[PDB]
Amino acid sequence: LRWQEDPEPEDENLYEKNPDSHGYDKDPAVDVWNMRVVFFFGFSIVLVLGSTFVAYLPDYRMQEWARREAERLVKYREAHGLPLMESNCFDPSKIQLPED
Amino acid sequence: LIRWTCARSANVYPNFRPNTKTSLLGALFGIGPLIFWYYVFKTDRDRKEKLIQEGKLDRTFNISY
Amino acid sequence: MMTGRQARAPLQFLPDEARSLPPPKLTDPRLAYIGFLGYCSGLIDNAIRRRPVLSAGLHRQFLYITSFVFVGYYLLKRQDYMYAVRDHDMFSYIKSHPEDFPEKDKKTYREVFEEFHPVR
Amino acid sequence: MLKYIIPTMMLMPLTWLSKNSMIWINTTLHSLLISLTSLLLLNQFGDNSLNFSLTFFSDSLSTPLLILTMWLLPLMLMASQHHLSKENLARKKLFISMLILLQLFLIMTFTATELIFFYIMFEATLVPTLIIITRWGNQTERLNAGLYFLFYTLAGSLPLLVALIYIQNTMGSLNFLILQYWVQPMPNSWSNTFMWLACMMAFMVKMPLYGLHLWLPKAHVEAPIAGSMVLAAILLKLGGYGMMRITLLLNPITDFMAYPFIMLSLWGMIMTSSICLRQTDLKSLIAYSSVSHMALVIVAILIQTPWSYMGATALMIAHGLTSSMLFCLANSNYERVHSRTMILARGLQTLLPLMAAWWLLASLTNLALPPSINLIGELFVVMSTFSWSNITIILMGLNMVITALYSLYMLITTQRGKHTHHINNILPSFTRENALMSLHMLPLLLLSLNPKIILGPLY
Amino acid sequence: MNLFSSLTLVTLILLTMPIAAINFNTHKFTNYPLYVKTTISCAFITSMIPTMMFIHTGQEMIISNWHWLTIQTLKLSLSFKMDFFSMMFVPVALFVTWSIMEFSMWYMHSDPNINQFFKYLLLFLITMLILVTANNLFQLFIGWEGVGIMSFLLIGWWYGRTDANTAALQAILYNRIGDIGFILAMAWFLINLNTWDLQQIFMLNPNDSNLPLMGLILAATGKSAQFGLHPWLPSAMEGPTPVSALLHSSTMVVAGIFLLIRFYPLTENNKFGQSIMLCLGAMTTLFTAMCALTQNDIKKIIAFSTSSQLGLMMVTIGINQPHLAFLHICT
Amino acid sequence: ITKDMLPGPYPKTPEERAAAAKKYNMRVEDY
Amino acid sequence: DKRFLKLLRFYILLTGIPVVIGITLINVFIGEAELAEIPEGYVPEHWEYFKHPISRWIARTFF
Amino acid sequence: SWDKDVYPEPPRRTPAPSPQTSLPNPITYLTKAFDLLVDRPVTLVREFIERQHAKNKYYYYHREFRRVPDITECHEKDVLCMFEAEMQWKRDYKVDQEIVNIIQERLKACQQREGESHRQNCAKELQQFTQVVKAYQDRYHDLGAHYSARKCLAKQKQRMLAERKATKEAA
Amino acid sequence: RDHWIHVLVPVGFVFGYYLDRKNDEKLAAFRNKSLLYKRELKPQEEVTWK
Ligand SMILES: CCCCCCCCCCCCCCCCCC(=O)OC[C@H](COP(=O)([O-])OCC(O)COP(=O)([O-])OC[C@@H](COC(=O)CCCCCCCCCCCCCCCCC)OC(=O)CCCCCCCCCCCCCCCCC)OC(=O)CCCCCCCCCCCCCCCCC
Ligand SMILES: CCCCCCCCCCCCCCCCCC(=O)OC[C@H](COP(=O)([O-])OC[C@H](O)COP(=O)([O-])OC[C@H](COC(=O)CCCCCCCCCCCCCCCCC)OC(=O)CCCCCCCCCCCCCCCCC)OC(=O)CCCCCCCCCCCCCCCCC
Ligand SMILES: CCCCCCCCCCCCCCCCCC(=O)OC[C@H](COP(=O)([O-])OCC[N+](C)(C)C)OC(=O)CCCCCCCCCCCCCCCCC
Ligand SMILES: CCCCCCCCCCCCCCCCCC(=O)OC[C@H](COP(=O)([O-])OCC[N+](C)(C)C)OC(=O)CCCCCCCCCCCCCCCCC
Ligand SMILES: CCCCCCCCCCCCCCCCCC(=O)OC[C@H](COP(=O)([O-])OCC[N+](C)(C)C)OC(=O)CCCCCCCCCCCCCCCCC
């Protein structure tokens, strides 16, 4: 024969001793307070107020500013006859070149 | 069913023997496509870079990449 | 490396010029970490003798914390002293050998030419 | 970042001093409070990163990874409290302490300003993960799987240690903020070739690269549910985060060193997806799908265009949520039938209709249904690889067929057809399980409304 | 202006309101199918006003109302194109869907999941009007994949049947093979034109439009079940008769034809694309009508009928008559 | 489930072939 | 399943309805700001560069 | 509203309704019903809310970044100055991106508004679009995901060397 | 306190937040000294940021 071993325990059903079990614990008061903690601090706090926070971020990575600033610059240079964007990012007067 | 899944997963390597057929099939289906797609994509990108640095490829409105 | 510096006054843990250095504060985070190591030593000492881990031997846990803070304060003084000696010898050697440490001309990027490598 | 490090450390006395019926509820509550506080990282700027100190900083790459990391701990606590209900109390507290310690290593992995502190936290993440797999895994093979997970990572990463200390000696620093401004072009040589390999292969193992992926369908299968969630949702993304930090230093040599690995990924995402067509183990099917999705992130980092980095960080966040939800669904069946065989329990929509709706939504986000951020990352990587080479769309599009085919076959085998007659322990879905599914899926669908926070440093 | 765009968006939001009603339920509904049928009747009546004032003046517009996502130079906005194609196809689809759902209130009367059936059928209608009112390729891809997934869920309605799951996965397979070409088209237009919007695609008007039009033809071959990607539309008769009647006769299956009709400024200048469309449509309308001659399942015969008529639609696109093709859709 | 009901190596001796056929619940003539 | 969906909708609406009512009260009674030119010599605070009141509250309070 | 010169609109010319038939169009009846039942109550609610806005009026500002020295006049490996130059360059890159977005909005609005004669009537918008895309492509294309002011300066110097060699070999 | 354990994580937040603010005063080398943001001090003000 083989050694001294406990037999395989059965898988428990949380609905037999507690038909209103939420799956958290076998103590029903602990189970229901675990449910309320998960649903309040997960859905009522992080999801709702978190989506409110993400929805009202103060110009996340300043895109809106960059629209409005662009709305300045075009409006500055539609008038003065300047081209809307130079192809050179830096002034060629302040660039030394390697001669040849 | 347990025997089927243990054959399909766990018994594969302990009953593997490297020989002629397994080496030719593992090098044919293992690195053959790697060599193939390497030379296809390298040829396409060398052709593309050679067109771009000569001013031949129409990259006019291409400012997203 | 610095074996000749601490050889004219041998076996001094803290020399006299270490007193010219500011000592570590008693609220040093390194010293508080060593106190935490003492507290963990007290907890392991209660655990290996099967005492109640947080409750038993508060005099013993407090002597663990006290001994690690006490030893670690001097260890931090010696650490700060040796890095101070390191920088002092570095700077005196740089000052004493200007032929080896030239002041390099910092060129601006309008003159500096770098090869561009396009990602495409 | 010390406003996130100290609450994560205070979760240790919070979990060791709680009452025996209270150690799940308190940790879940306060980890949700830490995850609520994690949104203060969203103070990101168009020009500068959010640079807290000499040690810690956060740009828009690390910020979604940090919010996902701090969000995954309550979900791991919810997932792992049923199957550890019969556990000893001290071992249960040690399990929770390993998850807390892993989160503590992860949040200062992603915020390490200096790259050797990144390496130390990046390799400190092995020890809680290894202990969790080899201690609370279910089957025999967890010891072997822990060995594979350990010794692929360390064999890839101990060259990375030498490489980072070499950059430390050459440049004088491993500050990422300094190395943004002192980076030198890395010329073509054999020295720089093995420099590139030593910088990249540790993260290739972490992604995983195809061919190096053999640790993953063991380590993600032989683990408990919290281990699979943190492995497939966060720990595969350390590789992508590390590549996006380290390819700054590897130019212009990457522009031809990437060519084999791109092939290994572009063919790899064809193979591993195809492997998901013929897997019997559902957890292994989710594992090979993880390899298939992370191959796109490897390609997008190695082609190093802006659209590719945006799609790669979107696809990493989206795959984190999706694959974590899929592992939780596979556990929701495995807690009932006690076998990971996918053909065993069929027709489960006849018995669990709301859970079948969760399976449906997870499989639709798995197959990159628009406008989910799964599809946003998928589509942007496809755009950037089309700009890389116009032929790759074939290998993309064929993948986008097979990605559909295993995502619905998994839905058809598990949930559809006639149910298995001899299985009669299929309980109704507990409120904990559907709570876990909703906390996976509702953030994933809300991020479709505002995807710009998960698009990375160059939105 | 203020009437046109208002009732335009009121049609779509009115369709989305019973989805909120079925998702916010606690009770057993007092005839939710009657509620959805009344909703679609009213949506048809609402959509007839912008149709009448398009018959009056020819009033087209664009509602780019919600800025969604700017990828550095690609501004994806929630953009709705009210032109001739939307103004005619939206009331026809609403009228047909209203008839299909009053049919479904009888044909599916014994079904205990009838509210799920009307939920899925309304979600199909919402995604199809997302498809046909779209102004950029991303939102059109949303409607495209949406009608593909609602096709999956409505073919595999009796999910215990193996053949329904098999035909649904078949339909998804052929549609994703078409989606390869659709994403090829989106990729070409983004890389070469920096846009997914239809207006910039039509204004730049490229002459090297071989590859994107081949991608769009592959997308239409997937979606409209042309030759090579045809058999899923006869296989799709496994779903209920309102599924085979709304989705697989009139509304979803014309989306590939509608996609090629939508890009008529590009097909009118590509004779090679017109030749490929003409040959593929003639091949499809021959082959499916020939297969229809000997079938005995009546839904298979009518499915080969509608695939033959889709092939005829592809023919009349291929002879540079896109408006006759769209008239044949609405007919 | 136990080890000698799991799949094993390739059978060569006829008693090993018969033990395999008994393991997979089929005849030796059909194995 | 019905108990879960009732609890899900309840714990969403529990803070969702007061936040929607509060956002309505802010948009009606507090109100969206108006774009002005910077005066001469005046240094605006960093939260005075944002338009919505909740965004100004976030930029003043936390960021 | 917005600035009517950066987003220009041509003058609307609608024809006077000249009905030839004897049947009444339903569109005028529906226009009056929309004016009564919809436009007036929406107008009243908006006037109520706007009075509530005017009861407490406060202002937000456009942030003005003064120009700092760019990457050319920063010394090599001098992080305190080249950091400021890099932040300046990144803000300019984001703003140039939105300039391209403005010109794309102009082109698409012109195409829809002109309708069928869009190919003739939108030549100026097409020309401005081609110029601004050529400028953006010369300035920022092919830099990579690890772009910087140094990358853009190196691309500009390579382009200027190519232009100088092409000029000199043509003389 | 009957619920002393429910302040271990929030106080550990605030203290941590406190230390973050305390670190900012050690990184105040270039306060009102950068070329972008340097300006004259307004009256009743001693530092630009804290
Ligand atoms: C009601 C219950 C609703 C549900 C509650 C529970 C919801 C669940 C929990 C949610 C928890 C929070 C989650 C985070 C949300 C945070 C808020 C947020 O993100 O807001 C964003 C966004 C911006 O809000 P904001 O930044 O605060 O305001 C910006 C303004 O510049 C500044 O604001 P303003 O001052 O300019 O705005 C004024 C506005 C105040 O603004 C608000 O209240 C906006 C905040 C509402 C947020 C609601 C979000 C909840 C989700 C809504 C969507 C799902 C609803 C359920 C399903 C519906 C069907 C789909 O004033 C009014 O509301 C009054 C106007 C009333 C008009 C109607 C009646 C007029 C005639 C009356 C005649 C009778 C009386 C005459 C005499 C009167 C004498 C006094 O707000 C919205 O998007 C509001 C929702 C409605 C948008 C338009 C809807 C139509 C769009 C149609 C085309 C597009 C769709 C096409 C689809 C096609 C089919 C496929
Ligand atoms: C900022 C505020 C935002 C407010 C608005 C919310 C925005 C979206 C949030 C998520 C919405 C869906 C949530 C419910 C689904 C999961 C649970 C479920 O299945 O319940 C069934 C259950 C009703 O079924 P039942 O009969 O009781 O039992 C279920 C059956 O046993 C068996 O069930 P079944 O199979 O018969 O029914 C499942 C059916 C199955 O149908 C499908 O699977 C077909 C769906 C795909 C094709 C159609 C959609 C294609 C995309 C177009 C739509 C998006 C763009 C539209 C715009 C125009 C174009 C651009 O799905 C639905 O009925 C759901 C319709 C909506 C699906 C959304 C797309 C999911 C597909 C995968 C991702 C694709 C991209 C997502 C983009 C999201 C953008 C926001 O619904 C509920 O009890 C609802 C519970 C409350 C839900 C709250 C949702 C918001 C939570 C956020 C909280 C924090 C923020 C505060 C806002 C609160 C607002 C109230
Ligand atoms: C982030 C990385 C980690 C990921 C996991 C994180 C988990 C932890 C949770 C953290 C908090 C939550 C994070 C995500 C929040 C995302 C939500 C959010 O902020 O959204 C902002 C977006 C912001 O959009 P916006 O940018 O337009 O907002 C304008 C900006 N303000 C408000 C300042 C003027 O919110 C909305 O869009 C809200 C719009 C109203 C509500 C939605 C209406 C439409 C819903 C569908 C209707 C039906 C249509 C047809 C379909 C029919 C059915 C198929
Ligand atoms: C996942 C498992 C596989 C992991 C693979 C990891 C990467 C593969 C290559 C690793 C090579 C070793 C680390 C290289 C570090 C380079 C740092 C550096 O300064 O390089 C430039 C230096 C150059 O020297 P230098 O820089 O001092 O010289 C001065 C500069 N010049 C050249 C101008 C004079 O490279 C070297 O010194 C040698 C580099 C190659 C080293 C080969 C020995 C290791 C053999 C392969 C080990 C592979 C993994 C082992 C584990 C396998 C599984 C068990
Ligand atoms: C029952 C609830 C309804 C509301 C009841 C209470 C209010 C009563 C009536 C008054 C109306 C509410 C006040 C006015 C509304 C808000 C006005 C406003 O300026 O809002 C700010 C803005 C308007 O857009 P915006 O352009 O000003 O801001 C976008 C933000 N930036 C610029 C930073 C990008 O947001 C909204 O209005 C959000 C509404 C969204 C509605 C549609 C959602 C579709 C969801 C699909 C998601 C995925 C799409 C992917 C594809 C996109 C296309 C490619």
Pocket test for ligand 1, best of E8, E10, E12, E14 (most atoms within 8 A of CB): E12
Residues with CB under 6 A from ligand 5: A 64; D 371, 448-449; E 66-68, 76, 78, 136, 138-139
Task: Report the interhelical angle of H26-34 vs E32-57 (nearest 10°).
Answer: 120
Residue carrying the six token digits 């057809």: D417
Q: Cβ distance D206 to D125 under 8 Å?
A: no
Which of D1, D49, D40, D39 is closest to D457 using CA atoms?
D49
CA dist H125 and H2 (Å) reads 19
> Phi/psi of residue E65, each to 5°?
-85, -40
State how beta strands H59-61 and E74-82 pair. Answer: unpaired
D444 lines ligand 2 (CB under 6 A): no
> Do residue D182 and residue H79 have CB atoms under 8 angstroms apart?
yes
Contact D441, D325 (CB under 8 A): yes
Task: Please give the single-letter amino acid code of residue D118.
Answer: F
Residue H110 in contact with partner chain E when CB distance is under 8 A: yes
Closest to E234 (Cα-Cα) out of E175, E180, E170, E283: E170
- CA dihedral sign of residues E279, E283, E284, E289: positive
- Residue D435 beta carbon below 6 angstroms from any ligand 2 atom: no
Reported resolution, Å: 2.7
Question: Is D51 within 8 Å of D177 (Cβ atoms)?
Answer: yes
Q: Which ligand has the minimum distance to the alpha carbon of residue D373?
A: 2
Phi, psi of E260, deg, nearest 5: -75, -30
Q: What φ, ψ does residue H100 adopt, rounded to 5°? A: -60, -40
Structure tokens belonging to residue D21: 């019926």
List D175's β-bridge partners, or say none.
D114
User: Which letter does DSSP use for residue H65 in this model?
Assistant: P
Q: What residues does D281 pair with on adjacent strands?
A: D341
Residue of chain H minimizing CA distance to A74? H6
Handedness of CA D195, D199, D201, D204 (dihedral sign): negative
- Whether residue E224 contacts residue E313, with contact meaning beta carbons closer than 8 Å, is answered with yes
CA distance B63 to H104: 12
d(CA E104, CA E242): 6
Q: How far apart are CA D157 and CA A97, in angstroms?
A: 43
What does the block give as tokens for E211? 């590859």
Helix (H, G, I), strand (E, B) or coil at C108: strand
Is the distance from CB of H87 to CB of A72 less than 8 angstroms? no
| Distance from Cα E87 to the centre of ligand 1, integer Å | 27
Residue with tokens 């265009």: D305
Residues of A in contact with H104 (CB under 8 A): none
Angle at which helices D237-246 and D282-303 cross, to 10°: 10
Burial class (CB in 10 A: 0-12, 13-18, 19+), E141: buried
How far, in Å, from the CA of D457 to the mean position of ligand 1?
A: 31
Domain-wise residue ranges, chain D: 1-459
**DSSP per residue, A58-71:** SSGGGHHHHHHHHH
Closest CA to D252 of H146, H138, B59: H146
Residue ID of nearest Cα to ligand 1 atom 78: H45
Tell me which chain B residues have a C-beta less than 8 angstroms from the C-beta of F23: 3
Are D372 and B31 in contact by the 8 Å Cβ rule? The answer is: no
Contact yes or no for H101 and A75 at CB 8 A? no
Q: Choose among H142, H150, H158: nearest Cβ to C109.
A: H150
The whole-angstrom separation of Cα D101 and Cα B9 is 33
Q: Where are the beta strands (DSSP E) in chain E?
A: 61-71, 74-82
Q: Looking at ligand 2, which residue's alpha carbon is closest to its atom 88?
A: G9
Q: Name the strand (E) or helix (H) holding E92.
A: helix E84-107
Question: What is the rounded CA–CA span in Å between residue D396 and residue D392?
Answer: 6
Are residues A62 and D45, on separate chains, in Cβ contact within 8 Å? yes
> D265, D220 in Cβ contact below 8 A?
no
Mode of pairing for the β-strands spanning G34-36 and H59-61: parallel
How was this structure determined? It was done by: cryo-EM
Would residue C79 count as lying in a domain?
Answer: yes
Q: What is the 3-state secondary structure (H, E, C) of D123-142?
A: HHCHHHHHHHHHHHCCCCCH
A87 with H138: CB under 8 angstroms?
Answer: yes
DSSP string, D31-86: HHHHHHHGGGGG---SSS-EE-SSSBEE-TTHHHHHHHHHHHHHHHHHHTSSTTSS
- Beta-carbon-side half-sphere exposure of residue D292 (alpha carbons within 13 Å): 30
Q: How far is I30 from chain H (nearest CA, A)?
A: 10
CB-based contact D393:D400 (threshold 8 Å):
no
C-beta atoms of E183 and D404 within 8 A: no
Residue D155 falls in which region: left (phi positive, over 0), alpha (psi -120 to 50) or beta = alpha
Phi/psi class of residue D114: alpha, beta or left (left: φ > 0; alpha: ψ in -120 to 50)? beta
Tell me the chain H residues in contact with residue G34 when contact means C-beta distances shorter than 8 Å: 57-60
Q: Ligand 3 site: residues with CB under 6 angstroms? A: A 46-47, 50-51, 54-56; D 35, 64, 67-68, 71, 317, 443, 446-447, 449-450, 453-454; E 16, 19, 66, 123, 126; G 52
The I-side interface with H (CB below 8 A) comprises: 30, 34-36
Tokens linked to B4: 């089927």
**H112 with E60: Cβ contact below 8 A:** yes
Length of chain F: 31
Nearest chain C residue to B49, by CA: C120
Q: Hey, is the C-beta of H107 within 8 angstroms of any chain B C-beta?
A: no
| Contact residues on chain A for D25, CB-CB shorter than 8 A | 24, 30, 33-34, 37
What is d(CA D234, CA D320) in angstroms, rounded to the nearest whole number? 7
Find chains touching chain E: ≥3 CB pairs under 8 Å: B, D, G, H
Contacts of E94 (CB under 8 A, 6+ apart): E11, E40, E43, E44, E47, E125
Kind of pairing between the strands at E61-71 and D57-58: unpaired
D162 Cβ closer than 6 Å to some ligand 4 atom: yes
Considering only CA atoms, give the Rg of chain H: 26
Strands (E) in D104-224, as ranges, are none
Nearest by CB to residue B58, choosing from E71, E73, E208, is E208
CA H112 to chain centre: 17
CA pair distance D137, D340, nearest whole angstrom: 13
Give C110's contacts in chain H (Cβ within 8 Å).
72-73
Q: Cis link prior to H26 (omega < 30° from 0)? A: no
Q: Is residue C45 part of a domain?
A: yes
Boundaries of domain holding C49: 1-97
Tell whether H11 lies on the interface with D, counting CB pairs under 8 A.
no
SS3 of E64, please?
strand
Provide the b/e sequence for D333-343 (b: ≥16 CB within 10 Å).
Answer: bbbbbebbbbe
The Cβ of residue D299 has, within 10 Å, a number of other Cβ atoms equal to: 29
List the single best residue of D181, D248, D249, D458 to mutate versus H (max H Cβ within 10 A): D181
Secondary structure, 3-state, E180-219: HHHHHHHHHHHHHHCCCEHHHHHHHCCCCCHHHHHHHHHH
Binding partners of A (≥3 Cβ pairs within 8 A): C, D, G, H
SS (H, E, C) C57-83: CHHHHHHHHHHHHHHHHHHHHHHHHHH
DSSP 8-state class, residue E136: B
Neighbours of chain G (3+ CB pairs under 8 A): A, D, E, H
- Count, residues in chain H: 171
CB E27, CB E37: distance < 8 Å: no
DSSP D427: P
Contact yes or no, E with B (3+ CB pairs under 8 Å):
yes
Give the residue extent of every domain in chain I.
1-50
Give dist(CA E14, CA E147) in Å, integer: 19
A55 CA → ligand 3 middle, Å: 6
Other residues' Cβ atoms within 10 Å of the Cβ of residue C100: 8
Cα(D123)–Cα(D105) distance, integer angstroms: 9
Chains A and I touch (3+ CB pairs under 8 A): no
Looking at the structure of chain C, the number of domains it has is: 1
A7 inside 8 A of chain H by CB: no
User: What is the position in ligand 2's atom list of the atom closest to the CA of D361?
Assistant: 72
In this complex, the chains that touch B, judged by 3 or more CB pairs closer than 8 A, are C, D, E, F, H
Query: Using CA of residue H27, residue H32, residue H33, residue H39, what is the dihedral sign?
Result: positive
Nearest CA-CA partner of D136 in D175, D172, D91, D104: D91
C109, part of any domain: no
Task: Decide: B44 and H121 in contact? Cβ < 8 Å.
Answer: no
Distance CA D403, CA E176 (A): 10
Task: For an interface test with G, give the residue of A45, A56, A59 to mutate (most G CBs within 10 A).
Answer: A56
Q: Residues near A10 by Cβ (< 8 Å), separated by ≥ 6? A: none
* Chains A and G in direct contact, meaning 3 or more beta-carbon pairs closer than 8 angstroms: yes
Q: Quick one: which of G23, G24, G16 has its CA closest to G54?
A: G23
CA separation for the pair D358, G1 (Å, rounded):
12
CA of H48 to the centre of ligand 2 (A): 35
